[PDB]
Amino acid sequence: ILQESVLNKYRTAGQIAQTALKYVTSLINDSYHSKTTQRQLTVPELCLLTDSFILTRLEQYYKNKVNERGIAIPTTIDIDQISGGWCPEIDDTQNLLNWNKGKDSTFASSVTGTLRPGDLVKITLGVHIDGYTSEVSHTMVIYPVDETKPILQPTGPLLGGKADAVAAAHIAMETVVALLACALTPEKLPASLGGTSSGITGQLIRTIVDTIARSYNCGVVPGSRVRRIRRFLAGQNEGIVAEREYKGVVWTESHQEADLLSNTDAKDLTVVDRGQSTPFTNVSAIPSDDFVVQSGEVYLIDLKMASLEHCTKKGLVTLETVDSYTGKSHKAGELIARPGAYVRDFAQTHILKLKTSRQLLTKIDKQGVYPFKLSHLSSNFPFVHENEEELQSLKKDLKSFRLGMSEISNNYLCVESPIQIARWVPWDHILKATNPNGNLSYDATSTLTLPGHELPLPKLGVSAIKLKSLMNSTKESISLPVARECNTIVLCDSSVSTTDRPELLRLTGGSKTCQPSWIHSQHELNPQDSIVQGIFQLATLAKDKRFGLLLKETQPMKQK
Protein backbone atom coordinates (compact mmCIF):
# COMPACT_ATOMS: atom_id res chain seq x y z
CA ILE A 1 0.00 0.00 0.00
CA LEU A 2 2.78 2.41 0.95
CA GLN A 3 4.75 1.52 -2.19
CA GLU A 4 1.58 1.71 -4.29
CA SER A 5 0.56 5.05 -2.78
CA VAL A 6 4.07 6.48 -3.16
CA LEU A 7 4.39 5.36 -6.77
CA ASN A 8 0.92 6.67 -7.62
CA LYS A 9 1.60 10.09 -6.10
CA TYR A 10 5.04 10.39 -7.68
CA ARG A 11 3.78 9.28 -11.09
CA THR A 12 0.88 11.74 -10.91
CA ALA A 13 3.21 14.61 -10.04
CA GLY A 14 5.75 13.66 -12.70
CA GLN A 15 3.20 13.23 -15.47
CA ILE A 16 1.55 16.53 -14.54
CA ALA A 17 4.92 18.28 -14.62
CA GLN A 18 5.83 16.71 -17.96
CA THR A 19 2.48 17.72 -19.45
CA ALA A 20 2.95 21.28 -18.21
CA LEU A 21 6.48 21.48 -19.63
CA LYS A 22 5.46 20.09 -23.02
CA TYR A 23 2.52 22.51 -23.10
CA VAL A 24 4.76 25.47 -22.29
CA THR A 25 7.31 24.42 -24.91
CA SER A 26 4.64 24.01 -27.58
CA LEU A 27 3.05 27.34 -26.63
CA ILE A 28 6.31 29.28 -26.82
CA ASN A 29 7.26 27.56 -30.07
CA ASP A 30 3.91 28.51 -31.60
CA SER A 31 4.17 32.07 -30.30
CA TYR A 32 7.75 32.77 -31.43
CA HIS A 33 9.23 29.90 -33.46
CA SER A 34 7.47 27.77 -36.11
CA LYS A 35 4.58 29.82 -37.48
CA THR A 36 4.90 33.58 -37.02
CA THR A 37 1.25 33.99 -36.05
CA GLN A 38 2.16 37.47 -34.69
CA ARG A 39 0.94 36.15 -31.31
CA GLN A 40 4.14 37.17 -29.56
CA LEU A 41 3.84 37.53 -25.78
CA THR A 42 6.38 38.18 -23.04
CA VAL A 43 7.42 36.11 -20.00
CA PRO A 44 5.22 37.21 -17.04
CA GLU A 45 1.82 36.60 -18.62
CA LEU A 46 2.94 33.20 -19.88
CA CYS A 47 4.20 32.33 -16.41
CA LEU A 48 0.91 33.40 -14.82
CA LEU A 49 -1.24 31.45 -17.27
CA THR A 50 1.04 28.43 -16.86
CA ASP A 51 0.59 28.59 -13.09
CA SER A 52 -3.18 28.88 -13.49
CA PHE A 53 -3.29 25.93 -15.89
CA ILE A 54 -1.19 23.81 -13.52
CA LEU A 55 -3.50 24.72 -10.64
CA THR A 56 -6.54 23.76 -12.71
CA ARG A 57 -5.01 20.41 -13.65
CA LEU A 58 -4.06 19.82 -10.00
CA GLU A 59 -7.51 20.68 -8.65
CA GLN A 60 -8.87 17.39 -10.03
CA TYR A 61 -6.53 15.08 -8.07
CA TYR A 62 -6.62 14.32 -4.32
CA LYS A 63 -9.10 17.18 -3.91
CA ASN A 64 -10.86 15.18 -1.18
CA LYS A 65 -8.68 12.19 -0.29
CA VAL A 66 -6.06 14.42 1.37
CA ASN A 67 -5.69 18.12 2.20
CA GLU A 68 -2.20 19.09 1.00
CA ARG A 69 -1.31 20.19 -2.53
CA GLY A 70 0.52 22.97 -4.30
CA ILE A 71 3.12 24.04 -6.83
CA ALA A 72 6.56 23.37 -5.38
CA ILE A 73 8.45 25.80 -7.62
CA PRO A 74 6.97 28.61 -9.74
CA THR A 75 7.38 28.17 -13.48
CA THR A 76 10.60 30.13 -13.95
CA ILE A 77 11.13 31.18 -17.56
CA ASP A 78 14.66 32.54 -17.27
CA ILE A 79 17.22 33.80 -19.78
CA ASP A 80 21.02 33.65 -20.05
CA GLN A 81 23.02 34.73 -16.97
CA ILE A 82 20.11 34.19 -14.56
CA SER A 83 20.89 31.36 -12.17
CA GLY A 84 17.23 30.85 -11.30
CA GLY A 85 14.24 32.11 -9.39
CA TRP A 86 13.67 35.02 -11.79
CA CYS A 87 9.90 35.38 -12.17
CA PRO A 88 8.81 38.78 -13.53
CA GLU A 89 5.34 40.09 -12.79
CA ILE A 90 2.98 41.63 -15.33
CA ASP A 91 2.47 44.82 -13.32
CA ASP A 92 6.24 45.30 -12.96
CA THR A 93 7.15 45.70 -16.64
CA GLN A 94 6.96 49.49 -16.41
CA ASN A 95 8.89 49.51 -13.13
CA LEU A 96 11.64 47.27 -14.49
CA LEU A 97 12.01 49.29 -17.69
CA ASN A 98 12.16 52.50 -15.65
CA TRP A 99 14.83 50.98 -13.40
CA ASN A 100 16.86 49.60 -16.32
CA LYS A 101 16.62 52.72 -18.49
CA GLY A 102 20.13 53.53 -17.28
CA LYS A 103 21.56 50.72 -19.39
CA ASP A 104 19.78 47.94 -21.31
CA SER A 105 22.48 46.99 -23.81
CA THR A 106 22.60 43.19 -23.59
CA PHE A 107 19.51 42.54 -21.44
CA ALA A 108 16.70 44.83 -22.64
CA SER A 109 14.87 41.86 -24.14
CA SER A 110 15.68 39.80 -21.05
CA VAL A 111 14.00 42.31 -18.76
CA THR A 112 11.10 43.12 -21.10
CA GLY A 113 10.26 39.45 -21.66
CA THR A 114 10.37 39.70 -25.47
CA LEU A 115 13.26 37.31 -26.02
CA ARG A 116 15.55 37.99 -28.93
CA PRO A 117 16.39 34.99 -31.13
CA GLY A 118 19.20 32.81 -29.83
CA ASP A 119 18.59 33.73 -26.19
CA LEU A 120 18.96 30.21 -24.69
CA VAL A 121 15.78 30.29 -22.62
CA LYS A 122 15.25 27.87 -19.74
CA ILE A 123 12.12 26.56 -18.03
CA THR A 124 12.09 25.22 -14.48
CA LEU A 125 9.05 23.95 -12.60
CA GLY A 126 8.10 22.17 -9.39
CA VAL A 127 4.87 20.61 -8.09
CA HIS A 128 3.99 19.51 -4.55
CA ILE A 129 1.45 16.87 -3.54
CA ASP A 130 0.85 16.09 0.15
CA GLY A 131 4.41 16.84 1.23
CA TYR A 132 6.05 15.26 -1.83
CA THR A 133 7.61 17.36 -4.58
CA SER A 134 8.76 16.79 -8.15
CA GLU A 135 10.92 19.19 -10.15
CA VAL A 136 11.82 19.62 -13.81
CA SER A 137 14.09 21.88 -15.85
CA HIS A 138 15.38 22.17 -19.41
CA THR A 139 16.29 24.72 -22.09
CA MET A 140 15.32 25.79 -25.60
CA VAL A 141 17.04 27.86 -28.29
CA ILE A 142 15.19 29.75 -31.03
CA TYR A 143 16.45 31.45 -34.18
CA PRO A 144 14.89 32.54 -37.50
CA VAL A 145 13.28 29.77 -39.52
CA ASP A 146 13.40 29.12 -43.25
CA GLU A 147 10.53 30.38 -45.38
CA THR A 148 11.18 28.22 -48.45
CA LYS A 149 9.80 25.05 -46.85
CA PRO A 150 6.43 25.24 -45.05
CA ILE A 151 7.64 22.42 -42.77
CA LEU A 152 9.48 25.19 -40.86
CA GLN A 153 12.57 23.24 -39.79
CA PRO A 154 15.42 25.78 -39.75
CA THR A 155 18.70 24.50 -41.24
CA GLY A 156 18.56 21.45 -38.97
CA PRO A 157 21.60 21.45 -36.70
CA LEU A 158 22.67 24.69 -35.04
CA LEU A 159 26.11 26.01 -34.09
CA GLY A 160 27.40 27.82 -31.02
CA GLY A 161 29.53 27.49 -27.91
CA LYS A 162 26.42 27.84 -25.76
CA ALA A 163 24.82 25.05 -27.78
CA ASP A 164 27.87 22.86 -27.18
CA ALA A 165 27.59 23.63 -23.47
CA VAL A 166 23.92 22.60 -23.53
CA ALA A 167 24.87 19.36 -25.28
CA ALA A 168 27.46 18.81 -22.55
CA ALA A 169 24.73 19.28 -19.95
CA HIS A 170 22.47 16.82 -21.78
CA ILE A 171 25.10 14.10 -22.04
CA ALA A 172 26.09 14.66 -18.40
CA MET A 173 22.46 14.23 -17.36
CA GLU A 174 22.25 11.04 -19.41
CA THR A 175 25.41 9.64 -17.82
CA VAL A 176 24.40 10.49 -14.25
CA VAL A 177 20.94 9.00 -14.80
CA ALA A 178 22.56 5.83 -16.14
CA LEU A 179 24.95 5.49 -13.21
CA LEU A 180 22.15 6.16 -10.72
CA ALA A 181 20.06 3.50 -12.47
CA CYS A 182 22.89 0.98 -12.11
CA ALA A 183 22.52 0.92 -8.33
CA LEU A 184 19.92 -1.85 -7.88
CA THR A 185 20.15 -5.70 -7.91
CA PRO A 186 21.88 -5.43 -11.33
CA GLU A 187 25.10 -4.66 -9.47
CA LYS A 188 27.29 -5.24 -12.55
CA LEU A 189 28.34 -1.68 -13.29
CA PRO A 190 28.81 -1.08 -17.03
CA ALA A 191 32.31 0.29 -16.48
CA SER A 192 35.75 -0.41 -15.03
CA LEU A 193 34.78 1.79 -12.06
CA GLY A 194 33.37 -1.20 -10.15
CA GLY A 195 30.67 -3.74 -10.93
CA THR A 196 31.79 -6.44 -8.50
CA SER A 197 33.02 -4.57 -5.40
CA SER A 198 31.94 -0.93 -5.12
CA GLY A 199 29.46 0.95 -2.97
CA ILE A 200 28.62 3.43 -5.75
CA THR A 201 29.48 6.60 -3.84
CA GLY A 202 29.83 10.19 -5.00
CA GLN A 203 33.51 9.95 -5.96
CA LEU A 204 32.75 8.15 -9.22
CA ILE A 205 30.07 10.68 -10.15
CA ARG A 206 32.49 13.51 -9.36
CA THR A 207 35.13 12.00 -11.63
CA ILE A 208 32.61 11.37 -14.41
CA VAL A 209 31.12 14.86 -14.38
CA ASP A 210 34.59 16.41 -14.21
CA THR A 211 35.72 14.33 -17.18
CA ILE A 212 32.64 15.33 -19.18
CA ALA A 213 33.15 19.01 -18.35
CA ARG A 214 36.82 18.85 -19.34
CA SER A 215 36.00 17.03 -22.57
CA TYR A 216 33.39 19.60 -23.59
CA ASN A 217 35.61 22.49 -22.38
CA CYS A 218 32.76 23.89 -20.27
CA GLY A 219 32.84 24.57 -16.56
CA VAL A 220 30.31 23.55 -13.93
CA VAL A 221 28.54 26.27 -11.95
CA PRO A 222 28.43 25.38 -8.23
CA GLY A 223 24.71 24.78 -7.99
CA SER A 224 24.44 21.06 -8.73
CA ARG A 225 22.41 18.78 -6.48
CA VAL A 226 22.27 14.99 -6.17
CA ARG A 227 20.11 14.56 -3.09
CA ARG A 228 17.71 12.00 -1.69
CA ILE A 229 14.38 13.57 -0.73
CA ARG A 230 12.29 12.74 2.32
CA ARG A 231 8.78 14.12 2.67
CA PHE A 232 8.42 17.90 3.15
CA LEU A 233 12.18 18.42 2.55
CA ALA A 234 13.57 18.50 -0.99
CA GLY A 235 16.29 21.15 -0.96
CA GLN A 236 14.02 23.59 -2.79
CA ASN A 237 14.98 26.14 -0.12
CA GLU A 238 18.60 25.99 -1.37
CA GLY A 239 20.46 27.17 1.73
CA ILE A 240 17.81 29.36 3.32
CA VAL A 241 16.36 26.53 5.43
CA ALA A 242 18.87 24.34 7.26
CA GLU A 243 19.02 20.66 6.28
CA ARG A 244 20.72 18.18 8.61
CA GLU A 245 20.10 14.52 7.76
CA TYR A 246 20.76 15.01 4.04
CA LYS A 247 22.94 12.36 2.40
CA GLY A 248 23.98 13.88 -0.90
CA VAL A 249 26.81 15.48 -2.84
CA VAL A 250 26.83 19.11 -3.96
CA TRP A 251 29.30 21.06 -6.08
CA THR A 252 31.13 24.09 -4.68
CA GLU A 253 33.94 26.31 -5.92
CA SER A 254 35.99 24.96 -3.00
CA HIS A 255 35.71 21.62 -4.77
CA GLN A 256 37.56 20.68 -7.98
CA GLU A 257 40.44 22.90 -6.86
CA ALA A 258 43.98 21.97 -7.84
CA ASP A 259 45.32 19.13 -5.72
CA LEU A 260 48.75 18.90 -4.09
CA LEU A 261 49.88 16.84 -7.13
CA SER A 262 47.97 18.58 -9.93
CA ASN A 263 51.14 19.40 -11.94
CA THR A 264 50.23 23.11 -11.83
CA ASP A 265 51.92 26.02 -10.08
CA ALA A 266 48.64 27.23 -8.54
CA LYS A 267 50.75 29.72 -6.54
CA ASP A 268 50.68 27.59 -3.39
CA LEU A 269 53.04 29.92 -1.48
CA THR A 270 53.01 27.48 1.48
CA VAL A 271 49.77 29.03 2.74
CA VAL A 272 48.85 27.45 6.07
CA ASP A 273 46.02 24.94 5.83
CA ARG A 274 42.87 26.21 7.53
CA GLY A 275 42.82 24.44 10.88
CA GLN A 276 40.19 26.84 12.18
CA SER A 277 36.84 25.23 12.94
CA THR A 278 34.08 25.89 10.43
CA PRO A 279 31.10 27.97 11.59
CA PHE A 280 28.53 25.86 13.43
CA THR A 281 26.09 24.76 10.72
CA ASN A 282 23.74 21.80 11.19
CA VAL A 283 24.89 20.14 7.98
CA SER A 284 26.85 16.98 7.24
CA ALA A 285 29.32 19.03 5.14
CA ILE A 286 29.63 16.80 2.06
CA PRO A 287 30.10 13.33 3.61
CA SER A 288 31.86 12.25 0.42
CA ASP A 289 32.56 8.76 1.80
CA ASP A 290 29.06 7.28 2.29
CA PHE A 291 26.68 7.48 -0.67
CA VAL A 292 25.36 3.92 -0.89
CA VAL A 293 22.06 3.94 -2.78
CA GLN A 294 19.21 2.14 -1.00
CA SER A 295 15.65 1.40 -2.06
CA GLY A 296 12.38 2.70 -0.63
CA GLU A 297 13.25 6.35 -1.24
CA VAL A 298 13.40 9.03 -3.95
CA TYR A 299 16.21 11.16 -5.34
CA LEU A 300 16.65 14.43 -7.23
CA ILE A 301 19.41 15.00 -9.78
CA ASP A 302 19.94 18.61 -10.89
CA LEU A 303 22.90 19.56 -13.09
CA LYS A 304 23.77 23.08 -14.21
CA MET A 305 26.81 23.79 -16.36
CA ALA A 306 28.49 27.11 -17.11
CA SER A 307 29.93 27.68 -20.57
CA LEU A 308 33.43 29.09 -21.01
CA GLU A 309 33.86 31.91 -23.51
CA HIS A 310 37.24 33.24 -24.68
CA CYS A 311 39.34 33.42 -21.51
CA THR A 312 43.11 33.86 -21.47
CA LYS A 313 43.65 31.33 -18.67
CA LYS A 314 41.65 29.22 -16.23
CA GLY A 315 39.88 31.03 -13.41
CA LEU A 316 36.94 30.67 -11.03
CA VAL A 317 33.18 30.69 -11.68
CA THR A 318 30.88 31.78 -8.87
CA LEU A 319 27.48 33.37 -8.22
CA GLU A 320 26.84 37.06 -7.54
CA THR A 321 23.63 38.35 -5.97
CA VAL A 322 21.51 41.05 -7.61
CA ASP A 323 19.98 44.04 -5.85
CA SER A 324 17.04 46.21 -6.90
CA TYR A 325 18.13 49.75 -6.00
CA THR A 326 20.17 50.92 -9.05
CA GLY A 327 22.33 52.90 -6.63
CA LYS A 328 25.34 50.59 -6.81
CA SER A 329 27.08 51.57 -10.05
CA HIS A 330 26.64 51.80 -13.82
CA LYS A 331 27.73 49.04 -16.21
CA ALA A 332 27.05 48.02 -19.79
CA GLY A 333 25.61 44.73 -18.51
CA GLU A 334 24.39 45.48 -15.00
CA LEU A 335 21.04 43.88 -14.15
CA ILE A 336 18.49 45.32 -11.71
CA ALA A 337 15.48 43.30 -10.61
CA ARG A 338 13.27 42.73 -7.59
CA PRO A 339 12.98 39.06 -6.58
CA GLY A 340 9.44 37.75 -6.29
CA ALA A 341 9.86 34.46 -4.42
CA TYR A 342 9.50 34.52 -0.65
CA VAL A 343 9.24 32.07 2.25
CA ARG A 344 8.32 32.40 5.92
CA ASP A 345 10.42 30.98 8.75
CA PHE A 346 7.85 29.49 11.13
CA ALA A 347 10.48 29.42 13.89
CA GLN A 348 9.86 33.10 14.66
CA THR A 349 6.38 33.97 15.93
CA HIS A 350 5.33 37.61 15.87
CA ILE A 351 2.34 39.82 15.15
CA LEU A 352 2.21 42.85 12.87
CA LYS A 353 0.28 46.12 12.75
CA LEU A 354 -1.88 45.90 9.62
CA LYS A 355 -5.15 44.14 8.85
CA THR A 356 -3.97 43.33 5.33
CA SER A 357 -0.68 42.02 6.73
CA ARG A 358 -2.54 39.76 9.16
CA GLN A 359 -4.84 38.46 6.44
CA LEU A 360 -2.04 37.61 4.04
CA LEU A 361 0.08 36.12 6.83
CA THR A 362 -2.74 33.73 7.71
CA LYS A 363 -3.33 32.97 4.03
CA ILE A 364 0.32 32.07 3.47
CA ASP A 365 0.20 30.05 6.69
CA LYS A 366 -2.64 28.07 5.11
CA GLN A 367 -0.43 27.79 2.04
CA GLY A 368 2.35 25.23 2.29
CA VAL A 369 5.93 25.86 3.36
CA TYR A 370 7.58 26.37 -0.02
CA PRO A 371 8.75 29.31 -2.16
CA PHE A 372 5.84 31.17 -3.71
CA LYS A 373 5.04 34.28 -5.73
CA LEU A 374 2.65 37.04 -4.73
CA SER A 375 0.45 36.34 -7.75
CA HIS A 376 0.20 32.77 -6.45
CA LEU A 377 -2.37 34.15 -3.99
CA SER A 378 -5.66 35.04 -5.68
CA SER A 379 -9.30 34.30 -4.92
CA ASN A 380 -9.73 34.45 -8.72
CA PHE A 381 -6.54 32.54 -9.56
CA PRO A 382 -7.96 29.50 -11.46
CA PHE A 383 -9.03 31.73 -14.41
CA VAL A 384 -12.09 29.77 -15.52
CA HIS A 385 -12.45 32.05 -18.55
CA GLU A 386 -9.80 34.20 -20.22
CA ASN A 387 -10.51 37.94 -20.19
CA GLU A 388 -9.20 41.20 -18.73
CA GLU A 389 -11.65 42.09 -15.96
CA GLU A 390 -10.26 39.15 -13.98
CA LEU A 391 -6.74 40.36 -14.75
CA GLN A 392 -7.43 43.89 -13.53
CA SER A 393 -9.16 42.62 -10.38
CA LEU A 394 -6.08 40.46 -9.80
CA LYS A 395 -3.85 43.52 -10.13
CA LYS A 396 -6.01 45.61 -7.80
CA ASP A 397 -5.70 42.85 -5.20
CA LEU A 398 -1.97 42.47 -5.91
CA LYS A 399 -1.40 46.11 -4.97
CA SER A 400 -2.59 45.53 -1.40
CA PHE A 401 -0.83 42.16 -1.33
CA ARG A 402 2.44 43.85 -2.33
CA LEU A 403 1.99 46.45 0.42
CA GLY A 404 1.46 43.73 3.01
CA MET A 405 4.44 41.78 1.71
CA SER A 406 6.55 44.92 2.07
CA GLU A 407 5.35 45.14 5.68
CA ILE A 408 6.35 41.50 6.20
CA SER A 409 9.81 42.25 4.79
CA ASN A 410 10.13 45.36 6.96
CA ASN A 411 9.53 43.17 9.98
CA TYR A 412 11.38 39.87 10.41
CA LEU A 413 8.81 37.42 9.06
CA CYS A 414 10.25 36.44 5.65
CA VAL A 415 13.44 35.85 3.68
CA GLU A 416 14.15 37.17 0.19
CA SER A 417 14.97 34.62 -2.48
CA PRO A 418 18.40 35.56 -3.87
CA ILE A 419 18.95 35.84 -7.61
CA GLN A 420 22.41 34.79 -8.73
CA ILE A 421 24.42 35.58 -11.84
CA ALA A 422 27.23 33.28 -12.92
CA ARG A 423 30.39 35.38 -13.14
CA TRP A 424 33.99 34.36 -13.80
CA VAL A 425 37.11 35.63 -12.05
CA PRO A 426 40.69 34.50 -12.81
CA TRP A 427 42.55 32.77 -10.00
CA ASP A 428 45.43 35.26 -10.26
CA HIS A 429 43.41 38.13 -8.81
CA ILE A 430 42.32 36.06 -5.81
CA LEU A 431 45.85 34.72 -5.29
CA LYS A 432 47.43 38.19 -5.36
CA ALA A 433 44.52 40.03 -3.71
CA THR A 434 44.35 41.48 -0.21
CA ASN A 435 43.20 39.11 2.55
CA PRO A 436 42.96 41.24 5.71
CA ASN A 437 41.17 38.56 7.74
CA GLY A 438 40.56 34.82 7.71
CA ASN A 439 36.89 35.19 8.66
CA LEU A 440 33.85 37.25 7.69
CA SER A 441 31.19 37.08 10.45
CA TYR A 442 29.11 39.67 8.59
CA ASP A 443 26.05 39.37 10.87
CA ALA A 444 24.21 42.05 8.88
CA THR A 445 22.24 40.24 6.16
CA SER A 446 18.64 39.11 6.64
CA THR A 447 19.27 35.84 8.51
CA LEU A 448 21.09 32.50 8.24
CA THR A 449 23.65 31.27 5.68
CA LEU A 450 26.21 33.83 6.83
CA PRO A 451 29.34 31.88 5.72
CA GLY A 452 27.38 29.99 3.05
CA HIS A 453 27.29 26.94 5.32
CA GLU A 454 30.82 25.79 4.53
CA LEU A 455 33.29 28.65 4.18
CA PRO A 456 33.32 30.03 0.62
CA LEU A 457 37.10 29.50 0.46
CA PRO A 458 38.46 27.29 3.25
CA LYS A 459 41.61 27.13 1.14
CA LEU A 460 43.44 30.49 1.25
CA GLY A 461 40.83 31.63 3.78
CA VAL A 462 38.87 34.03 1.55
CA SER A 463 35.49 35.33 2.72
CA ALA A 464 32.35 35.78 0.64
CA ILE A 465 32.19 39.58 0.91
CA LYS A 466 35.84 39.90 -0.05
CA LEU A 467 35.32 37.44 -2.91
CA LYS A 468 32.43 39.42 -4.38
CA SER A 469 34.26 42.73 -3.88
CA LEU A 470 37.25 41.36 -5.77
CA MET A 471 34.91 39.98 -8.43
CA ASN A 472 33.35 43.37 -9.10
CA SER A 473 36.83 44.95 -8.91
CA THR A 474 38.09 43.38 -12.13
CA LYS A 475 38.66 44.18 -15.81
CA GLU A 476 37.45 41.19 -17.85
CA SER A 477 34.52 39.89 -15.75
CA ILE A 478 33.23 37.73 -18.58
CA SER A 479 29.62 36.64 -18.05
CA LEU A 480 28.91 32.94 -18.56
CA PRO A 481 25.44 31.58 -19.40
CA VAL A 482 24.26 28.49 -17.52
CA ALA A 483 22.44 25.48 -18.95
CA ARG A 484 20.37 23.79 -16.23
CA GLU A 485 18.30 20.61 -16.16
CA CYS A 486 16.90 18.41 -13.42
CA ASN A 487 14.81 15.29 -12.91
CA THR A 488 13.59 12.87 -10.25
CA ILE A 489 14.50 9.21 -9.74
CA VAL A 490 12.34 6.60 -7.99
CA LEU A 491 13.54 3.11 -7.10
CA CYS A 492 11.26 0.09 -7.39
CA ASP A 493 10.77 -3.42 -6.03
CA SER A 494 9.36 -6.79 -6.98
CA SER A 495 6.56 -5.89 -4.57
CA VAL A 496 6.15 -2.58 -6.41
CA SER A 497 5.94 -4.29 -9.82
CA THR A 498 5.66 -8.08 -9.60
CA THR A 499 5.69 -8.17 -13.41
CA ASP A 500 9.40 -7.35 -13.53
CA ARG A 501 12.49 -6.94 -11.37
CA PRO A 502 12.91 -3.87 -9.13
CA GLU A 503 13.07 -1.12 -11.75
CA LEU A 504 13.85 2.60 -11.83
CA LEU A 505 11.30 5.26 -12.79
CA ARG A 506 12.49 8.56 -14.26
CA LEU A 507 10.18 11.45 -13.40
CA THR A 508 10.19 14.66 -15.44
CA GLY A 509 12.69 13.13 -17.86
CA GLY A 510 12.78 11.02 -20.99
CA SER A 511 13.21 12.06 -24.62
CA LYS A 512 9.48 12.67 -25.08
CA THR A 513 9.72 15.61 -22.66
CA CYS A 514 13.43 16.48 -22.98
CA GLN A 515 14.17 16.34 -26.70
CA PRO A 516 17.19 18.63 -27.22
CA SER A 517 17.45 21.21 -29.96
CA TRP A 518 19.05 20.15 -33.23
CA ILE A 519 22.73 20.72 -32.38
CA HIS A 520 25.81 19.32 -34.11
CA SER A 521 29.43 20.31 -33.53
CA GLN A 522 32.84 18.86 -32.67
CA HIS A 523 35.07 18.79 -29.56
CA GLU A 524 32.75 16.19 -28.02
CA LEU A 525 34.39 13.68 -25.63
CA ASN A 526 37.39 12.95 -27.81
CA PRO A 527 38.12 9.26 -28.51
CA GLN A 528 41.08 7.03 -27.57
CA ASP A 529 43.04 7.48 -24.32
CA SER A 530 41.35 6.52 -21.04
CA ILE A 531 38.31 8.75 -21.68
CA VAL A 532 36.64 5.84 -23.54
CA GLN A 533 34.96 4.80 -20.27
CA GLY A 534 32.14 7.26 -20.89
CA ILE A 535 31.53 6.04 -24.44
CA PHE A 536 31.55 2.43 -23.24
CA GLN A 537 29.16 3.36 -20.44
CA LEU A 538 26.70 4.99 -22.84
CA ALA A 539 26.86 2.06 -25.26
CA THR A 540 26.24 -0.37 -22.40
CA LEU A 541 23.36 1.73 -21.08
CA ALA A 542 21.87 1.49 -24.57
CA LYS A 543 22.46 -2.27 -24.88
CA ASP A 544 21.89 -3.45 -21.28
CA LYS A 545 18.49 -5.01 -22.01
CA ARG A 546 18.53 -8.58 -23.28
CA PHE A 547 15.01 -7.97 -24.57
CA GLY A 548 13.79 -5.38 -22.03
CA LEU A 549 15.41 -3.16 -19.40
CA LEU A 550 14.56 -2.09 -15.84
CA LEU A 551 14.15 1.62 -16.62
CA LYS A 552 10.82 3.33 -17.25
CA GLU A 553 9.72 6.88 -17.98
CA THR A 554 6.44 8.70 -17.43
CA GLN A 555 4.32 10.12 -20.24
CA PRO A 556 2.19 13.27 -20.48
CA MET A 557 -1.60 13.45 -20.80
CA LYS A 558 -3.95 15.16 -23.24
CA GLN A 559 -6.01 18.15 -22.15
CA LYS A 560 -9.35 16.31 -22.29
Binding site: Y325, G327, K328, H330
Partner: protein
Protein backbone atom coordinates in the same frame (compact mmCIF):
# COMPACT_ATOMS: atom_id res chain seq x y z
CA UNK B 1 30.98 59.48 -15.92
CA UNK B 2 28.59 62.37 -15.40
CA UNK B 3 28.15 65.48 -17.53
CA UNK B 4 30.90 67.95 -18.40
CA UNK B 5 30.37 71.64 -19.10
CA UNK B 6 32.58 71.88 -22.19
CA UNK B 7 30.01 69.81 -24.11
CA UNK B 8 26.96 70.58 -21.97
CA UNK B 9 27.08 74.31 -22.77
CA UNK B 10 26.35 73.75 -26.49
CA UNK B 11 22.55 73.64 -26.11
CA UNK B 12 19.76 76.20 -25.86
CA UNK B 13 17.42 76.94 -22.94
CA UNK B 14 14.43 74.71 -23.71
CA UNK B 15 15.92 71.23 -24.06
CA UNK B 16 18.47 71.91 -21.33
CA UNK B 17 15.74 72.93 -18.87
CA UNK B 18 13.69 69.87 -19.84
CA UNK B 19 16.70 67.64 -19.18
CA UNK B 20 17.22 69.42 -15.86
CA UNK B 21 13.61 68.71 -14.87
CA UNK B 22 13.92 65.06 -15.92
CA UNK B 23 17.10 64.56 -13.91
CA UNK B 24 15.50 66.35 -10.95
CA UNK B 25 12.71 63.78 -11.13
CA UNK B 26 15.38 61.07 -11.29
CA UNK B 27 17.10 62.44 -8.19
CA UNK B 28 13.78 62.62 -6.35
CA UNK B 29 13.19 58.97 -7.19
CA UNK B 30 16.71 58.15 -5.98
CA UNK B 31 16.02 59.99 -2.73
CA UNK B 32 12.84 57.97 -2.27
CA UNK B 33 14.76 54.77 -2.97
CA UNK B 34 17.64 55.48 -0.59
CA UNK B 35 15.34 55.09 2.43
CA UNK B 36 16.25 51.43 2.94
CA UNK B 37 19.98 51.10 2.37
CA UNK B 38 22.27 53.66 4.06
CA UNK B 39 24.99 53.88 1.38
CA UNK B 40 24.46 54.88 -2.26
CA UNK B 41 27.49 56.39 -4.04
CA UNK B 42 25.52 57.24 -7.20
CA UNK B 43 23.94 60.39 -5.76
CA UNK B 44 27.22 62.34 -5.84
CA UNK B 45 27.22 62.30 -9.64
CA UNK B 46 23.58 63.41 -9.58
CA UNK B 47 24.38 66.36 -7.32
CA UNK B 48 27.38 67.44 -9.39
CA UNK B 49 25.34 67.14 -12.59
CA UNK B 50 22.49 69.28 -11.25
CA UNK B 51 24.97 71.86 -9.98
CA UNK B 52 26.71 72.01 -13.36
CA UNK B 53 23.43 72.35 -15.25
CA UNK B 54 22.17 75.13 -12.98
CA UNK B 55 25.48 77.01 -13.17
CA UNK B 56 25.66 76.84 -16.96
CA UNK B 57 22.06 78.06 -17.18
CA UNK B 58 22.93 81.02 -14.97
CA UNK B 59 26.11 81.81 -16.90
Amino acid sequence: AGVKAYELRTKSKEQLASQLVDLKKELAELKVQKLSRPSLPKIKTVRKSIACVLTVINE
